[PDB]
């Protein structure tokens, strides 16, 4: 039937948004873990050429000085959602003198994740992970092209999604620490990627309560690899 978003199935359903979830599946993998000491985050780069400059490939962007991000799926759809999410926290600070909470960021983002045929275009092709430290401690969230917003404790999306999530439920518990969960993460990464893991295949991002700066690791990452 499908061929268009203005159409139902006899059973449910779409059949158009279902195909949008399929477009995530050929993206790169990405893992974020929520822990009481702070939210760590990891991703795989998949660099093609050595002539290809590596830092032009973004997977972690900085939404605000206490909220990180991680994406998969279509880059062309992603750059629009990153652009608004920076503005929405910025307007909220302009009219309230405060920082927008991590949950209410994604509410503003999901409000045009679902506008695709709801005017008076296609749905987007990108899934997102949002980590941040607001007044309720550290938070980690996840959305989809269907706008279904949810909270996750440790999520992994992109390709190797099911292969990560099965292994990731084995090691997670409530009383983790931040330095434990970083090396707990990239053990899963080298199991699910195809290349030998080095300092050029992956990158990290951690946010802490007292360390609103530096959602990043810059060649201290080389030290974490030999601590495997």
């Amino acid at each position: 039937y499908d061929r268009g978003v203005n159409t139902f199935s006899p059973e449910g359903r779409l059949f158009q948004v279902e195909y949008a979830i399929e477009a995530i599946k050929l993206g790169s993998t990405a893992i974020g873990i929520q822990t009481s000491e702070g939210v760590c985050l990891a991703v795989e780069k998949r660099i093609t050429s050595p002539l290809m400059e590596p830092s032009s490939i973004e997977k972690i962007v900085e939404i605000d000085a206490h909220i990180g991000c991680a994406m998969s799926g279509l880059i062309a759809d992603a750059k629009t959602l990153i652009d608004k999410a920076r503005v929405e926290t910025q307007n909220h600070w302009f009219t309230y003198n405060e920082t927008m909470t991590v949950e209410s960021v994604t509410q503003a983002v999901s409000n045009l994740a679902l506008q695709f045929g709801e005017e008076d275009s296609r749905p987007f092709g990108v899934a997102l992970l949002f980590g941040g430290v607001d007044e309720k401690g550290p938070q980690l969230f996840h959305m989809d092209p269907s706008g279904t917003f949810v909270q996750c404790d440790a999520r992994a999306i992109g390709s190797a999604s099911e292969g990560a999530q099965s292994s990731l439920q084995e090691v997670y518990h409530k009383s983790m620490t931040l330095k434990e969960a970083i090396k707990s993460s990239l053990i899963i990464l080298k199991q699910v990627m195809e290349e030998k893991l080095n300092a050029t295949n992956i990158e990290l991002a951690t946010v802490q309560p007292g360390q609103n700066f530096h959602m990043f690791t810059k060649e201290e990452l080389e030290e974490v690899i030999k601590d495997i």
Partner: protein
């Protein structure tokens, strides 16, 4: 096999009409470009003149601002609009903000213009792919490229056009970890790379350089003939 609309996802999640535009790039002329120590350079593969026309109207390399360059592929109808549009934006930026325009700002504009142009039906996407070169952002040489999907992206060396795959594999075995200084050496790299042309006539090359402080310098077919002579001369000594 529905390939007849741009707002439809495949059941394995594709946009084939975006994918079909990039096939139209591969019927375009090749163009390469590297960045150097101080002097950037790019070269094109110019097709044969048909003996009865003027050749100052077949312009394939243009400048947007006084310090940023441009090389494209695809089809010249869609290329002329994007050039004419981006000349306005790099000029209007200077009015609203008194700086010169960085090379990174103008590629985000071209990509975002090609971005929003993809999404609506009845707007056939731009089947071109651009190379943007400029040592403009405070003495720092950069080169980027675009894509008909609308994804700007940074390389250190590049090739487009018909059979760019041969050239890109050629550069990885040729672009040394030695950063090629002595900028005629860097020009000798590109002229040797374009000497592995689809035809390599020798008299069909137009190279354009920029020494990061001057304006654009189109080379002349006597100086470019000198560099082709020393490439064959130095290659004969290797035996």
């Amino acid at each position: 096999s529905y390939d007849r609309a741009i707002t439809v996802f495949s059941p394995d999640g594709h946009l084939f009409q975006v994918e079909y535009a990039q096939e139209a790039v591969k019927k375009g002329s090749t163009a390469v470009g590297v960045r150097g120590r101080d002097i950037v350079v790019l070269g094109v593969e110019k097709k044969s003149v048909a003996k009865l026309q003027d050749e100052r109207t077949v312009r394939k390399i243009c400048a947007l601002d006084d310090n940023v360059c441009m090389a494209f592929a695809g089809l010249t109808a869609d290329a002329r609009i994007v050039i004419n549009r981006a000349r306005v934006e790099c000029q209007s930026h200077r009015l609203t903000v008194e700086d010169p325009v960085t090379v990174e700002y103008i590629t985000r504009y071209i990509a975002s213009l090609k971005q929003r142009y993809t999404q609506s039906n009845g707007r056939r996407p731009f089947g071109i792919s651009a190379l943007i070169v400029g040592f403009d952002f405070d003495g720092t040489p950069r080169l980027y490229q675009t894509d008909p999907s609308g994804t700007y992206h940074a390389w250190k060396a590049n090739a487009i056009g018909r059979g760019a795959k041969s050239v890109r594999e050629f550069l990885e075995k040729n672009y040394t970890d030695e950063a090629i200084e002595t900028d005629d050496l860097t020009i000798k790299l590109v002229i040797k790379a374009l000497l592995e042309v689809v035809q390599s006539g020798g008299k069909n090359i137009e190279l354009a350089v920029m020494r990061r402080d001057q304006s654009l310098k189109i080379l002349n077919p006597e100086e470019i003939e000198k560099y082709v002579a020393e490439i064959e001369k130095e290659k004969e000594e290797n035996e």
